[PDB]
Amino acid sequence: ASKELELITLTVGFGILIFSLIVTYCINAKADVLFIAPREPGAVSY
DSSP: OHHHHHHHHHHHHHHHHHHHHHHHHHHHHHHHHHTTOOOOGGGOOO
16 A cells, blocks of 8 residues: 555645745746836746
């Protein structure tokens, strides 16, 4: 059952990263607006 447990643990880790990203992303945009600074679509390069 260790496998199932390992998978669940990894699932949470990935979820945490997603939220963290959405948090830093929202802040990054706020700054770009706070001072009419360069802005790109979804900050996606290329």
